[model samples]
Target chain A: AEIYNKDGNKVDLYGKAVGLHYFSKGNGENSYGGNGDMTYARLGFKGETQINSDLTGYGQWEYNFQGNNSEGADAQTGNKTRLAFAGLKYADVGSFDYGRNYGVVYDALGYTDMLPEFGGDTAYSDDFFVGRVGGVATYRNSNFFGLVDGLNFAVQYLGKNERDTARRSNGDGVGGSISYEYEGFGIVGAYGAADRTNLQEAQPLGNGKKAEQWATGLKYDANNIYLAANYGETRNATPITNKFTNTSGFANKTQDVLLVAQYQFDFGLRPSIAYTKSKAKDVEGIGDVDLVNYFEVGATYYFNKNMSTYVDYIINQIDSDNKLGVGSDDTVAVGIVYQF
Target chain B: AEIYNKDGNKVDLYGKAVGLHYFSKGNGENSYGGNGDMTYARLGFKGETQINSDLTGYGQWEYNFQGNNSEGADAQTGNKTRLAFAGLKYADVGSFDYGRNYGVVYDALGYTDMLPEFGGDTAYSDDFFVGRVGGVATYRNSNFFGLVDGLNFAVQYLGKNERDTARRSNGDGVGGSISYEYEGFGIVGAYGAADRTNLQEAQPLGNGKKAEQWATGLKYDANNIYLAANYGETRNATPITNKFTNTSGFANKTQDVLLVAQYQFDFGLRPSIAYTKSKAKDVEGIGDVDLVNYFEVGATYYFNKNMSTYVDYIINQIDSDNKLGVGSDDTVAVGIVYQF
Candidate 1:
């Protein structure tokens, strides 16, 4: 047994399974779907070794089914890389790592993305921000001072040629964040930006446009009640041309904002609500049109921390004055996630 | 803490993340890229359960990112299964496994592919050999002679319809290898072949042709220095015609040779160099051509045994005035790998 546990290290294998029933309604039409949901099934490995008195090395390889089991291209097949990284930590200094990892800005979303079915405002839309950077370098320090406990900072760099194509002028991206917490209270601020030099001309965001984002959020907990909210804004340097009009007239620079709130009861149940709004300004060639608004509400029941189920509903609509008017859409879903 | 360690047996997670800035120069324009490096990021799970005093059962699931993080199509993003085998091992008898694994012929390459960057001659090209065979059944024994020490043998079979397309003919493959060592010297011989009856006519290699390979190698190690060299030949019953010329001129059989040498230092540094040459003989349509010559040199530094970095350079060149008139190409990169 000792030989099997060579190098004074131990390895662990873990996995999570998730499934859902989905339904939607729009323009007096009823649509239904089953077993298709974000955050499907995942399996991973996490390992750590103490290298010295003050240092340790750790690594993780996490992957998901990517919708292979119930739907998508292949059934009961397909795996998408999730977390693949290795790092070293110093007892006093901090830690550093390389490889595919989450951007600091996305982590900065904090409790805003903690809900069972929604509130992942910062990462829910690809148009606004890059969720995870494949090739990345990151550094973090949990303690800045001996007296100021629970304070930390993270910085990350996403290589240009990583997931971003060579078509952009400069494809490199960077992000950073700082957060502190004490006595059930916490707050975080984060920012990330990608160079647009090598960005492809055909991208919906336009030919020579840089994508940038920033967010700030806070959380408080007491007496079995948990509450948190986050607000973020995204800016596109060059507005995309409207595909409908085949022109830049309606292609104006855009901005977005999101807010969320949630509370947990003593009975292992949590209820959450979120609202998001997007608007377009700087219209030129075409008529001005405002972006649609979205609202979501959900409740989750936990069998234990490692297993749970939830019900969620979402509604989105455009303003009456919007061009090429579109009616509101409503969606409902019930999902479950089990981890072992 | 024990609650975190579930299952009757503890699980372990392990991975390696390596990324490189790949640079290449050819006959035309200079090209630069990233992420073509040694041992891509991989995640795996393996566990063993003791059945008796002399027997145990084990299974493993391993996958690699395989450049999908940086390039390629979405359909190919799915993680390619590396090891999906289950087996039983007897303390004194041997082991039997079923699933996917290295072909006996490829395993015979052994120390020949020990270099940090190159020397995997037999598997460097798809046209030459089968590297890891899917749907495989293998058996190995480390002690075939009860009184002998360091004597081993392995045999493997690649089943039809395992991972191959439906077009191939009879798609069966088989291989075997044996090795022995005494003091600081060792030698190995291996052979493999595959039946391609169901092979599609569209395949360049022509229809109903059998692919075969044989290799022999020797190694000597003392102190911190290690040396090895391997010779191998491959035969395709029906050579594939040149796509450009639409003829068998340069499509004759292929033979490859590889050599490697390395020296490890006490300070945790190892430098290695390798060279391989491939030749095509018996031209029919036009003239015979030497496929290419590849040379690689690199050094790796091990912080411990689990972490290291290396810089490697590879240069390959084709013969002059070839059918396609292709020239030389070179690539260089610095890569780091950390495993836990």
Candidate 2:
């Protein structure tokens, strides 16, 4: 949505509003709700102002309305901040951004989270990858190495701060990603790390707990079929303790692998299927919660180019090594979306 | 704000950015903050896709950027959801919308909330009427009764659900409104109810209660003057318990009345004044709090059609059955709003 166009500067307003009806039965409970799952309901303001011949000033304020409040809707739930940043871009030299933004590592994992419902269940989901970190700066260049037409690279850093009163330090972190695309094939590699500190974090979680993550993704598209796969692992990762666990800290190492395939038809119908597995090891003090597997299948029918309906189902199975019980769960969701 | 238009489909983006410097002295505390009121800082995306010559598919995602967090901008508060829905509209018939939206009752109270600040305190400000409900379905007709050119009506429903864990069964509710406008005069009547249930609700002095609300509003605008008034009552309304109160529930019935008058000038300046009163009975169990009266006066100046600034001051006086230490409070707010 372009609000204005003067000289060579253009200011635009863009966003999406999506909601769904979701049903789930898990953990000995059943719930039916309405909200957005695949693409969050949000609005943002962005624009670029010319600053000379080869330079431009850019900024954006992207806010989300329904983030973690899927339980229900209340008018007074309060608004939340998503992305707030300002940067300078040079036509041939690259760009620098300062403020809040996604971690460089997540750039490589983007294809995994592309699913309408699930799949982005990696370090970023747990904040270990510093997804949308504040006090961060990033540099990106689309012509990496200047040797290939579709090569790009990016690096980001989050500074240490005492912004969170509960935690002593936010533990600084750094991340980077490199990608190359040609024809219908593409590949990306990414890595991120956070330094150890004595920040009073949380059970099964720690601030500055010396964490590291690395991932690789490969994807291909031809005809009307799309295929993608991802493999990633985290070392000395912060642990997420639950009611059934007894220990905390980075005692559990985790690994994840995901594969997805989808085929589109000219009749406005598309179907997709995916499988993901997450494994944990070195659980010395905690109870035996070790493996989780997810299976999903869904289809979307387009009413037209801007309107569509989708229905998807997911099954989550958990495994343990001890008396600690891990329940199996299933969820079914259906929704219609209209975008402009 | 139309971003794209093709084949009879249009998608648009719209929102306002507003911030205020609010100063308040009340409840033995004094503080100043920056945020928004009346019209919150929000962004939304809406569009319509022509399904055929007589039908269209429409959807919107309206999210808030600054809701309850008035404590300056830290840029970390995640975005909160406001309204997310999709529906089908018929060219000559009414429209059916499903998802989250304002209760039909608010359609009538809109005039009272139209004030730049403070007068809409009866419902939305406190969620006493579940101002916005999820899992709701609404039908609206602009050609009410098909008898008049400026008549409208709306009906809304919220099904029972246990989605809000904080409150028990979000009891089923039904609401509707009828209004007519011609020339510069308008009137609206509305009613809403949430079936009595074990909805562990809250109040200044009540808990686990049921609620119902109804109101009527009148307004007129001509030349450069505008006038409006509202009268309403709530039964089994949730009580907002405070530090000085102990009992809570809908046991205390409440009634409210408000009046507002404003005038605009040719020099891009406008001024307004309003008065509202709320009364509650049988408050012996809680603090002696029984009555609240508010008086406000403000003015606004337009820098242009897209920019404006406003200053407002409000004084709230409280009365009780006994000397329970409740005192008067006051607030002064100044703000700037930029809309596109």
Candidate 3:
């Protein structure tokens, strides 16, 4: 929503309030435990002002508001920053910024991460340069500096965050991504490497290691049809899944893959189906295991532009009598979103 | 800023980014010690949908963003709920709302609380029915049910916020306020009463007591001139000032008075002067002492409707060798606010 425009400047507000509930879980988990609140509002403000004929300065601030006192908890919880950054853009040359922001690797991972809920858990925040963490400086160029069509690339530097525990810290890192599109079809790749904090090396789980991530993806969107696939691997970056764990909490290495397809109906309904898996290699006693394996389906119906309802169903391929018989339970969730 | 308006429904984005600093203090304090971030953003959203021509359903949510990792802190800090509520309004009757809201007594206290910064300390947030707190249901009638002009009244109920500590709990409370204005002159009165939590009675500092508050105020605004005065007292509601202390943490009673005057110049300059005093009675060690006695001067210069700069100088009358020679010091503050 554009709030105002004047003097070659534009201010806009964006975000949504999501009210969701999970039911019929395969794990028989208590409804409102641990997840905190599924009902929360993401709010943001963005503005750009022309600094000169060739330059524009822009900034954004986004926040997460955990709407109510979480379930039956006494005090409200889970309020935090989603994004905050300011940048200078010179026409089509590029943009440079430093602040809390998405990692460069997300440029390729974003395609298959568009599910209404739960499809993007593979790349966790605070793990490394693969999600929306903090303290990253980035330089991005679009359309090959305005010469080539549908080409984009970015280079980002991640600074050290010395947490008490090293498992959650990315001492230093660098990331890069490049993507090109033609006639609604696109291919992209991203890579990131970081040094683990010294504290992490002291942990038995860490076993002294660096963190690395890389991904390659392909996507197509046209005529209301969308298809995307991502294949990635992480070493000391991705960790063991709680539902299927090992003595070593951190995964020695893992290969992740996701495939998604969606079709937007003319009647404002979009249905999506996805399959994702993460295979962990070299556990303490186990040789290899599929940490995550799931099939997911969801549909969203739009009521005008600002309101929508969705239902998502999941099938845990590795749970119960399934593929590996050891993984998270399946569940279904219904949600309504109001955006502005 | 109105983001959307359609079908008799309107959605708005409101709030501001406040960057402020206190400097040149009479106490020679550190710039950023306990106050956390003086630079923070307040953001809010409001929307109303017409249930029919005679009624509307509305809701609002507001938040405070501490902007950055607090200075020298290992982690981010100070994130919480500011306001959240939903209501229905019947034309020519009244409006009713439930959730978090301001206490009713602010109707009278607000008149003299308009300093650019730090003028509303007499009304505490968590102390009940004086400032913005949580869990309040309110019924407000404006313009005397649309019959009289410039007349308003509100009755509010505050729910219990049971914390491990009782000092911040309102327990159960009821508040009411009425105000009338004619020819740029206004008068207001307010009252509140509440039960003290049992835990409060157990505390030696609490002294086992109920809480009650009352206030009366007068104000005028005509042409470019504005003036207001407020007299209020609280028993077991208002607490001792930190700048002036006693053996008992909670004040037995407090009486506060504030007077303010301002003039808005044609060039968008508003200079204001205010004087306030809060006296605590029957302290454990110090009986009937002035907790706060400040004469403050401030001015705000508007760059436009959404942007302004302000400077404030606070002079404490009861500090050092003044008065009884026992109190807090003074300080100067400068601020810039950008609102949307």
Candidate 4:
């Protein structure tokens, strides 16, 4: 199994699967997991296979222990593992992938040194929330011409197979991303659409139309220090329009703006800090949702090139005028991730 | 707007919605919306659109609020919502779709008629749990083969979409179902496979593949009476496999047996009762998840097809097991549902 430090350090491989977790009374409000007495126990696998020059096939699958003294659900089981998928890649033609995957927001957050892997817990963590795209048929093009020596670009698309009406509200969500980099300077742009109806019955999933979200950012790295800035947006059309009029008429939008930066230190250690402010925006059909702002920082120390330990914290707050009744909350976490 | 009553009456075009919920004493286990007190609250829009003699469009996007509230999530701000999709049909040829759809288990449960939607709930509500297959490409073929008359088939595939993968743990899931009807006898079969990965990455997201579950069932309906029986199972792999190898290879598995019988006094006034028994096999990876039994009975009166009022009692019992720390508990719920 492959592992990484909470600070994004590559650890060793293969060890005791047994794990014990205890969470200080921090109230995990970051959505990283849940409010529990412990950080919860999780086990997973991560590995990579070299296909050719500058090419590889890699994937990971992990499950949380939430059932018995566990968290809530099992997320890793064989091919259904948390990171189950295999793909071929090239330094040039980009890459083709299948199975579960991370969207632009997720990748950007990770690359920018956010809350480690605690992005989905929107209410819990002080990290940027990344919507997970599953069963993805995705393609990532190689870096285009370099603007500066480190400037490059990438694009990707994800699609669903079971396309229908009842499931359209969810089944038809398409996504894409673009990025550029030069030395310590990097910028990424991404977008995705999710919907059940739009133009035609035979139209792609999400109908002929779809809910859409996008992101863009710039990053720079030199020596052991790095800095980055990013922005993202998510939108979905209201399903009510499909009831009587064209499905394309209704819409709901949520946006996130993030400014993240980090620096790498010596002594087998690296520390980084990031801050992100997000807003669900005033949706036409659903009205306005609460606004959220998150701040986080983490550090990792590596032992050799394969082992490390990390501690990260995210402070999040939500302010809302909507009537849904979600009180503001925050979370802080510290853990060590080891991979083999 | 399309409407239907619990008694199987179709008002065709009506205006109304039905939903009810409560927060149990302990955790509301196995919920689609969220966890803790809040159990389930579902609201929806279902209707049909015809463009040609043989061409028609059908759609349904039901929001199930599980975000710690009984207020059904909808265009009505704040609350969380789930399940949405749309599709089109060519009665003569077949139906192709692009939207949220259903997995194999969903179709099989449709015939079980022993879950909450039918009669049973509390401990064994797999039927209701197997709702729409979000972000899928879906299709249904009208099975018309003389003797097989009302036979039909459906298939769906789910994608994680372009959302971030950090908290969603979204992955690839595939499901399909086939049902046939001959006179008073009907049977359905469904299956699903999910590749769950990125556990910590997709935290808090509803779409996570941790295992594979499947179900099959048979039903008989004659005049005002009907009966159904079904069996379901799920299997998963966990971190335990890392140490115990063979033992951890199979994380968890659950099997269920269900029975339901419903009688209609007047097409508009009917009552139904159901019982379900489910058992989770013990495993080194997940441990004995305990056994659960559920019983339910309810009645409803329809006023035209647009509206209906109803109430029911669902009793649930969980047996103590080594795999669970929550211990065994019992609960009863009473609620109402309407469609428009």
Q: Estimate each model's TM-score.
A: 0.79, 0.72, 0.57, 0.41
- In model 4, the Cα lDDT at residue B150 comes to 82
Per-residue accuracy of model 4 over A201-290 as CA lDDT, tens digit each:
333212234555566767777777677776666554322222222332323455666666666666767776777665554534445555
lDDT tens digits by residue: candidate 3, B1-340: 8877866667987889888766654445522122323677887888766656786766677776666554675233554566666566789899877665678888899999899887876777667788776666689999999999999999998766555555566577889999999999999999998888776666544354578888999999889999999999888777543333322346678889999999999999999999998888875555677867889888999989999999988886665532223445567778889999
The lDDT, on a scale of 0 to 1, for candidate 3 is 0.75
User: Candidate 1, residues A152-256: lDDT per residue as tens digits?
Assistant: 888877655423443212246778888988898888888888765434444443434566767777777666666676666655532334545544311334555
Lowest summed lDDT over 10 consecutive residues: which window, candidate 3 chain B?
B28-37
DockQ, all candidates in order: 0.24, 0.24, 0.07, 0.01
Best-to-worst ranking by DockQ:
2, 1, 3, 4
- Give the per-residue lDDT of model 2 (tens digit) for A72-130: 33333544577889999887678999987777778767766656655666634235453
lDDT against the true structure, per candidate, is 0.62, 0.66, 0.75, 0.48
lDDT of 4 by residue, B1-340 (tens): 5323222211122223345454344565532122233234444445344435664544443333343344454322322223333345665567654443444466777665544343422222111125533345566676652335788777776544222222222356667788888889988887767666554223321223455667788999888888898887765521112222322233356667778877877757768787776656655445455444667666766666656656555555544442433324444444455554
Residue A151 of model 1 has an lDDT of 88
Query: Residue by residue across B1-340, what tens digits does model 1's lDDT show?
Result: 1111434454544456664445565312221122332225775667776677787888877776642253223314545777789899898678989986766776557768887755574563223223655677889888783456988888887686522532223357777888888888889888878765444333543333566777888888877878888887766532334536644321336677888889998887999888877666654543455565777778997767666767777765654455533345566766656665
Steric clashes per prediction: 22, 25, 0, 99
lDDT for B242 (candidate 2): 44
Residues B65-152 of candidate 2: C-alpha lDDT, one tens digit per residue: 7544556664335345666788877875788876666778788777867566456766552232336556667888887645678788
